[PDB]
């Protein structure tokens, strides 16, 4: 049907917006602390601490498979990146502080994205 292809046109254009947003988020992480999953070889206890790991490459795989149905789902994954790091790493660490900074700077990007998703539809 044609309406399935308009919705697919909706999902497709959400994906185009979300890719730009992801690239802008991933620019606020020049250290690449959040680029890949935490290594279970290097942190073998990680899953005892963090139940739902996330990272930018994992978000990107999902985006490219048109796996984000709305902005809420995408924000949930970006919030896992931040939140997992602030739980696993102590307040006085380079990791924790990188997450705070990503959260702060990301908020600006996400605030305008929410306006574009509502505005464009």
Q: Going by C-beta distance under 8 Å and a sequence separation of 6 or more, which residues neighbour residue 22?
A: 56, 59, 60, 63, 74
Q: Which of 19, 30, 26, 28 is CA-nearest to residue 55? A: 26
Domain boundaries, the chain: 1-121
Q: Class of the 1-121 domain?
A: mainly alpha
CA–CA separation, 45 and 54 (whole Å): 16
List gaps in the chain by the residue before each (C–N > 2.5 Å).
Answer: none
CB 68 within 8 A of CB 15: yes
CA–CA separation, 47 and 102 (whole Å): 23
Please state how this structure was obtained.
X-ray
């Amino acid at each position: 049907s044609m309406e399935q292809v308009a919705m697919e046109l909706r999902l497709t254009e959400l994906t185009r917006l979300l890719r730009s947003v992801l690239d802008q988020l991933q620019d606020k992480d020049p250290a690449r602390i959040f680029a890949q999953p935490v290594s279970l070889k290097e942190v073998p206890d990680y899953l005892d601490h963090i139940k739902h790991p996330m990272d930018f490459a994992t978000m990107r795989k999902r985006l490219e498979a048109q796996g984000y149905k709305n902005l809420h789902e995408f924000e949930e994954d970006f919030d896992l990146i931040i939140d997992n790091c602030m739980k696993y790493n102590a307040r006085d660490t380079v990791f924790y502080r990188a997450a705070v900074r990503l959260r702060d700077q990301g908020g600006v990007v996400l605030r305008q994205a929410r306006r574009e998703v509502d505005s464009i539809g």
